Design an enzyme around this catalytic site. Structure first.
Site, short mmCIF file in Angstrom:
data_model
loop_
_atom_site.label_atom_id
_atom_site.label_comp_id
_atom_site.label_asym_id
_atom_site.label_seq_id
_atom_site.Cartn_x
_atom_site.Cartn_y
_atom_site.Cartn_z
N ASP A 1 3.67 1.07 -1.96
CA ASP A 1 2.79 1.90 -3.05
C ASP A 1 3.73 1.91 -4.07
OD1 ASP A 1 1.13 4.27 -3.38
OD2 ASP A 1 3.12 5.47 -3.23
N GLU B 1 1.03 -2.59 -4.06
CA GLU B 1 -0.03 -2.03 -5.04
C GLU B 1 0.60 -2.33 -6.35
OE1 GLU B 1 -2.46 2.26 -4.86
OE2 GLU B 1 -0.08 2.29 -5.26
#
Lengths: 714, 144
Positions: A359, A395
Site C-alpha cells: 500500500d 501501489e
C-alpha cells in the site's frame, strides 16, 4: 523483595520479541529501544487484565536492544511493556511509562483498543495538547500481546514450494476476508467472514470454478478502529491502519484471539495451497494507526518515537505525513528496516505467504523528503535470499508531492497500472483518446514499463479496485455517494471516469439495465484480452454493488458484504466472467513474457500484431496519433517471440478484436481471412451475419460493442 | 467378588516428551509439592466433573498454570498403586483416602482415573505425565 528475588536469566537479543524456548522451559523477551532509560515487562493473568499480575524490570541490554528471559512462562502468557524516559515533545521525545505499549514483534494480540482519553500520553482536554503529559494508567484499555507457539504441521504443503503459479499466467482476485463470507448462510456462523470461512470446501470449490489462480487479501495486519470512526458509530472495514506487523487480525479470525488467530490463519493458507491457490496479502508498511501527534500512544511512539517515525527535522514535534494518515514510518532507521523485512520474511517462511501488494509503496522510498528507489530498504529486499523469490506488487505512488512513481520501481516489482485503469474507463465512457494511447494499454503498456527493462506481466491491468467504484457501480453512477460515511461526502475522489448508461442509481428502464450489462461485459472483455496480468475485483463477478459509495473503508455492513443471492441477470454475468477467465487462461497469446514488436519474425509473412481502422487498411503514423472511439488489432498467434521455460516456442490461434466505444454504430471491413465469432458483449441473440465473416466483408457493429474473432482460413 | 486383570496395550505416543529426558530439575534446586490426586481437584468446579479428582483433572490447563504460578518444580503424588479399601473401613462407612494399602505394583489406581478402568487408567496416567513434562514439571510418586 526487589526484581532480583524472582528467578531470571539474562536472555538474548537475537530473535526480537517473545519467543517460547521449549528446551529451557521459559520465554525470551526482546525489544529494541535506542533511547529508553528503563524498560519494564508486564505479565497478566487471563482473568485479570486491568493490573499486571507481575512487574519485571528489563535490566539487561546488549546494544540498542533490551532483553530478559523469564523462567516458568509458557506460550499463551499475556504481556506488555512500559518504557521510561525523557518527555520532550518539541524535540521528539514522547516517553510516558504510564501508557501501556504493545510489543512491535508480538505475533498475536488479544483484542483491540478500548478508546479512552487515558491511552494518549497527553492531556486530551489541555490547551497545550500534545506538549502535556497525562499520567493516567491505560493498561486496562489497551490489548495485551500473547506469547505464541510457532509450531504447525503443513500437510503436503511443501510441495507447492516448487512449481508455483508464474505471474505470466496469473489472474489476481482481490478479496475482503469478512465480506467474502459474512452473508454465506451456506456456512455456519462462527466462521462467516473469517479465515476458516474463506478456506471452507464451499468457497474453495467456488474459487476454482471462477478460475482465478491467486487471491489478494485486503489488510490482514492486526489493526485498530480509528476513534473518529468510533465516535460516529463506525468501524475500520478495510483495515489499512495497523499497529503490529506480525499478528494476523483478531477480527478476521474465528477460533480464538489467544493465539487462535495465528492458527486459523496458517490452517487457512494450508487449505488454499492444497487446492493450488497462491496467496498475496495487501500490506501497510508506510504508516501506523498511532496517527500523527494528538494520536494515541499504544506502541511505537512509546517505545522509541524518534526511531520509528519520520519527524519534521526542524521541529521534530510534528510528523512528516506522506500517506495522508498522520505519520509515515521512518524506513531510514536500521532497526525499522530490520522490522519490515523481518515481518516480510515472517509472513513468508512462517505464515507461508506467496506475495505482497504494498500500500502506497512510494512512501517506503521516502528519505527525508525525496523519493529515491535506490534506498537501503529496497536494496536489502532485492538481495535477500528468500524475499527475492516471492512476488512484490506496488501501489506505485503516495499522496506526497512528487510521489507519482509509476514505472520507476525496481524490476521483480510489479505495479498496479493506474494509467490502464483511467484510460480504459474513459474509452468505454465515450471519450475519444489517441489510437496510440489505448493501443499501448492493450499490449501491456510498453511505453510505461519497457524503459526500465520490465516485461508485460509486470503490468497489473485492472478496471476496478477497492479504491473507488465497483464494476456494477461504475456503470450505474456519475457522482460519489459517500453520505453514509459521515464526512459530508467530501471523502473519496471526485473524478471516477464514470457513466450511468442513463440514470444514477437503481432503475427499471430497460435500456439502462442493458447498456450496463453490455458495458459490464465490455470492460470484462477488454481486461482479459490485454497483455499483462489482470486483477479481478472481488464480487464483481457477482455484480456486487456498494450503493454508489466509492470509498467504503468505514462500512462494515450490508454495503460491503458480498450478496450471494443471485437473480437471472447476475447468474448469467457470472458465467460470462467464468468463460472469459477460462478463455484468457487457455490462450498464451495473452499470457506473454515478452512484448509484441511491430514486426514479422522467424521469416514469416505475417507480423505478430497489426492495427487497422474502419476500413481494412493499416494504421499509419497520423491515424496512430489521432483520437478514436474504435480500435482494431490482429494478434498473429503463430508468429510470437514467446518461449517457455524449456526452450520451446509457443504460438496460439490468430485473433482479431473489435473495440468500438463510439455510441453510434460503425461498419468495419474485415481483413482478408475467414473469421469466426468466439465471444462478444452483445446481450441479444447473435444472428448469423455476424457469426462467420469471409473475404474482406463489411459488418455492422452497434455502438459500444466489443468483439473477439479467430481466423479459421487464409 | 474380586476384580479381574486386563491385558493392556502398552503403546503410547509421547509428544516431545523425550527431550525432558536430559536437562531435568536437579535436586539442588528442587521444591517438592506433595499432592493427593483426588483432593487436588475434587472441589474444582472450574473443571467439568468426570475429571474432578482425577489424573486428567490434575493435568488440565487450569491446574498446570496454577502449579507454575505457585513455582514448585516437581510434584510428589500420594500412593497411586492400585489399592483396596479395607473391610474394617468399609464396615464403618469409610474409604481408603490415602491408599497406602495396595495389592498390585504395576496398575495405576482405577479410582484416580477418569476415562475408563478397562485400560483407561493406564492411558489417562501416561497422558497426565506427558502434560506435566510438556510444562517442565517432574513427577515423584509415593510408593508402598
Amino acid at each position: 523483595f526487589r526484581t532480583r528475588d524472582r528467578p531470571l536469566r539474562p536472555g538474548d537479543p537475537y530473535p526480537l520479541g517473545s519467543n517460547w524456548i521449549e528446551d529451557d522451559d521459559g520465554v525470551n523477551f526482546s525489544l529494541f529501544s535506542e533511547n529508553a532509560e528503563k524498560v519494564e515487562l508486564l505479565l497478566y493473568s487471563l482473568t485479570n487484565q486491568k493490573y499486571p499480575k507481575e512487574i519485571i524490570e528489563v535490566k539487561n541490554k546488549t546494544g540498542d536492544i533490551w532483553h530478559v528471559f523469564v523462567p516458568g512462562l509458557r506460550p499463551g502468557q499475556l504481556y506488555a511493556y512500559r518504557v521510561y524516559g525523557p518527555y520532550k515533545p518539541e524535540l521528539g521525545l514522547r516517553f510516558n511509562p504510564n501508557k501501556v505499549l504493545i510489543d512491535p514483534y508480538a505475533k498475536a494480540i488479544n483484542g483491540s483498543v478500548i478508546w479512552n482519553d487515558a491511552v494518549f500520553g497527553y492531556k486530551i482536554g489541555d490547551q497545550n495538547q500534545d506538549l502535556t503529559y497525562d499520567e493516567r494508567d491505560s493498561g486496562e484499555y489497551v490489548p495485551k500481546s500473547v506469547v505464541i507457539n510457532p509450531y504447525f504441521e503443513w500437510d503436503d504443503e511443501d510441495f507447492i514450494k516448487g512449481k508455483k503459479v508464474p505471474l505470466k499466467d496469473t489472474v489476481i482476485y482481490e478479496v475482503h476476508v469478512k465480506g467474502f463470507t459474512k452473508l454465506r448462510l451456506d456456512l455456519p456462523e462462527n466462521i462467516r467472514g473469517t479465515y476458516e470461512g474463506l478456506a471452507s470446501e464451499q468457497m474453495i470449490s467456488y474459487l476454482k470454478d471462477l478460475g482465478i489462480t491467486t487471491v489478494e487479501l485486503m489488510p490482514v495486519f492486526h489493526f485498530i478502529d480509528q476513534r473518529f470512526l468510533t465516535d460516529k458509530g463506525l468501524t475500520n472495514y478495510w483495515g489499512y491502519d495497523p499497529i503490529n506487523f506480525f499478528s494476523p487480525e483478531c477480527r478476521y479470525s474465528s477460533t480464538g484471539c489467544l493465539g487462535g488467530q495465528v492458527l486459523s490463519f496458517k490452517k487457512m493458507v494450508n487449505e488454499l495451497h492444497n487446492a493450488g491457490i497462491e496467496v498475496i496479502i495487501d500490506v501497510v508498511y508506510n504508516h501506523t494507526a498511532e496517527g500523527n501527534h494528538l494520536g494515541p500512544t499504544l506502541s511505537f511512539r512509546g517505545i522509541d518515537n524518534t526511531a520509528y517515525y519520520m519527524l519534521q527535522p526542524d521541529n521534530k514535534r510534528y510528523y512528516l505525513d506522506f500517506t495522508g494518515t498522520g505519520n509515515t514510518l521512518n524506513l531510514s532507521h536500521p532497526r525499522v528496516i530490520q522490522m519490515v523485512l523481518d515481518s516480510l520474511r515472517y509472513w513468508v517462511t512462517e505464515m507461508h505467504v506467496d506475495g505482497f501488494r504494498f500500500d502506497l509503496a512510494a512512501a517506503l522510498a521516502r528519505e527525508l523528503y525525496s523519493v529515491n528507489m535506490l534506498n537501503t530498504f529496497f536494496i536489502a529486499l532485492q538481495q535477500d535470499p528468500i524475499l527475492s523469490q516471492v512476488k512484490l506488487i506496488a501501489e506505485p505512488w503516495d499522496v506526497g508531492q512528487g510521489g507519482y512513481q509509476v514505472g520507476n520501481f525496481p524490476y521483480q516489482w510489479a505495479e498496479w497500472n493506474g494509467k490502464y485503469r483511467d484510460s480504459i474507463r474513459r474509452f468505454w465512457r465515450g471519450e475519444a483518446l489517441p489510437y496510440s494511447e489505448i493501443a499501448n494499454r492493450l499490449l501491456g503498456s510498453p511505453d510505461i514499463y519497457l524503459g526500465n527493462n520490465k516485461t508485460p506481466f509486470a503490468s497489473i491491468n485492472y478496471v476496478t479496485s477497492h479504491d473507488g467504484f465497483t464494476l456494477e457501480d461504475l456503470v450505474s453512477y456519475n457522482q460519489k455517494h459517500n453520505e453514509a460515511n459521515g464526512f459530508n461526502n467530501q471523502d473519496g475522489m471526485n473524478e471516477n471516469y464514470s457513466w450511468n448508461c442513463g440514470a444514477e442509481g437503481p432503475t427499471n428502464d430497460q435500456n439502462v439495465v442493458i447498456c450496463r450489462e453490455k458495458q459490464k461485459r465490455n470492460f470484462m472483455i477488454t481486461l482479459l484480452v490485454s497483455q499483462g496480468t489482470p486483477m479481478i475485483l472481488g464480487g464483481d463477478e457477482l455484480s456486487r454493488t456498494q450503493r454508489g459509495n466509492n470509498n467504503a473503508f468505514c462500512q462494515d455492513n450490508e454495503i460491503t458484504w458480498f450478496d450471494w443471492n443471485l437473480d437471472e441477470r447476475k447468474s448469467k454475468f457470472l458465467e460470462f466472467v467464468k468463460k472469459m477467465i477460462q478463455f484468457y487462461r487457455a490462450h498464451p497469446a495473452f499470457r506473454r513474457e515478452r512484448y509484441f514488436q511491430g514486426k514479422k519474425l522467424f521469416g514469416m509473412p505475417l507480423k505478430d500484431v497489426t492495427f487497422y481502422t474502419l476500413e481494412g487498411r493499416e494504421v499509419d503514423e497520423k491515424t496512430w496519433s489521432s483520437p478514436t472511439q474504435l480500435v482494431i488489432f490482429v494478434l498473429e498467434g503463430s508468429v510470437m517471440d514467446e518461449i517457455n521455460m524449456y526452450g520451446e516456442r509457443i504460438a496460439d490461434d490468430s485473433f482479431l478484436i473489435i473495440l468500438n466505444a463510439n455510441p453510434n454504430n460503425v461498419k468495419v471491413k474485415f481483413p482478408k481471412g475467414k473469421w469466426e465469432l468466439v465471444i462478444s458483449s452483445y446481450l441479444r441473440e447473435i444472428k448469423p451475419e455476424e457469426r462467420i465473416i469471409e473475404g474482406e466483408k463489411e459488418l455492422e457493429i452497434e455502438g459500444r460493442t466489443a468483439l473477439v474473432y479467430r481466423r479459421i482460413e487464409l
